[PDB]
Amino acid sequence: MKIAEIHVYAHDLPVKDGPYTISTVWSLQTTLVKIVADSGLAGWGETCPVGPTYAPSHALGARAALAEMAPGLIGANPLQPLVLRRRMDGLLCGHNYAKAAIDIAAYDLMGKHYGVRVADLLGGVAAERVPSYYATGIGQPDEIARIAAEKVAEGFPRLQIKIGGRPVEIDIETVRKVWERIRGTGTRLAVDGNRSLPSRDALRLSRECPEIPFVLEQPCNTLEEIAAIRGRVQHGIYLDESGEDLSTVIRAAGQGLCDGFGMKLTRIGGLQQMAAFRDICEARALPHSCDDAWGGDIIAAACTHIGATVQPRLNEGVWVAQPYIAQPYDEENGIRIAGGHIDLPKGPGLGITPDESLFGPPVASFS
């Protein structure tokens, strides 16, 4: 097989009952990639930054990066994801979030070609139904507590409470009121500082609440700050935004700098790298989620496929933007949350067939 065509698409996704406050976002522009083989067989990828301020990545940026690489990828074998990743690195440094769109499209194409689900190309389906988790927005303490209780009732096995960007007393009150509503339900709790807490405040949050079993997710902006407070914090600490590449994961795992990860597939550079990430975590019993920043059926299915291969006791869940998205790409097999969990699609490849019409004509085509 050989890549004959690459098509790049721009597409809008508005948030139902927005805004979503982390980066505050009111609507999203996702970028889709279609790879077409010699045989006419096609595979789909997707990348969608959650606003331009959450990570060093944006929509205009994804398309420029993809247009930079695409002519150099015509003629490449799409059935060789590691060889393909190296070829990409030879065309553009960094830009993992754009390279991930190509990597996903290639696995989709591989699965369709061999007649196999992407999860089975990544080591095999460990669970047909994968846990998810609900991430609350920043808001009033009592209202976040009400939402938390409602989501536990829906069947979510884990909740992530977003905090920061305001006095930490309010964050602390939110955490306590949420715990009061969900204690004794067996629901797991994460508190996500989204890089916004000075060490002063991360120390206070943990010191004041030893009896509340949260993990502190990316509380500070840099890995250096996190490494400095770790010894003084008795709650587990997870890395998210700091987990920028496999090399950094190796540093954090090998030097014992964290107790887990919230990992985004686009950030690490795609499924080839994500599988290696998964294996490092499993060797060290580090729980992790398999998420992305945002996006529709394509990126959501990719996250679900890698999530289905994770050892169940280490699976902190797969987050998807589906509940905030009005129009799915695939009304028949698209990714849906049901009872706080996600059923893996049953068909070959990602198991998703995008209604290509929805996206409009490509903003760029390459052959």
Rounded Cα distance between 257 and 250, Å, is 10
Rounded Cα distance between 24 and 100, Å, is 24
CB burial of residue 144 (10 Å; 0-12, 13-18, 19+): buried
Among positions 49-68, residues that touch its own copies (CB under 8 A) are 52-58, 60-61, 63-65, 67-68
Binding mask 259-298 for its own copies (x = CB under 8 A): xx-----------xx-xx--xx--xxxxx-----------
Among positions 114-143, residues that touch its own copies (CB under 8 A) are 114, 116, 120, 122-126
After what residue numbers is the chain broken, C–N > 2.5 angstroms? 22
Nearer to Mg ion, 6 or 189 (CB): 189
Coil/strand/helix, residue 237: strand
Which of 221, 322, 333, 365 is in the footprint of its own copies by CB under 8 A?
221
Taking the complex as a whole, how short is the minimal distance between the CB of residue 93 and its own copies, in angstroms? 5
Nearer to its own copies, 86 or 336 (CB): 86
Rg (CA), the chain: 20
173 a known binding residue?
Answer: no
Decide if 264 is catalytic: yes
Can you read off the two tokens belonging to residue 26? 């009111």
Decide if 2 is catalytic: no
Nearer to Mg ion, 46 or 192 (CB): 192
Nearer to Mg ion, 148 or 308 (CB): 148
Total binding residues toward its own copies, as defined by CB under 8 A = 95
- Return the amino acid letter for 340: G
| Cα dihedral 59→321→327→51 (10° resolution) | -30
The one-character DSSP state at 314 is: G
Q: Is residue 63 within 8 Å of residue 33, measured between CB atoms?
A: no
Contact segment (CB under 8 A) with its own copies among 34-42, 234-242, 292-300, 347-355 equals 234-242
Known binding residues for substrate: 54, 160, 293
User: Which residues are part of the catalytic machinery?
Assistant: 162, 264
Show binding-site residues for Mg(2+).
192, 217, 240
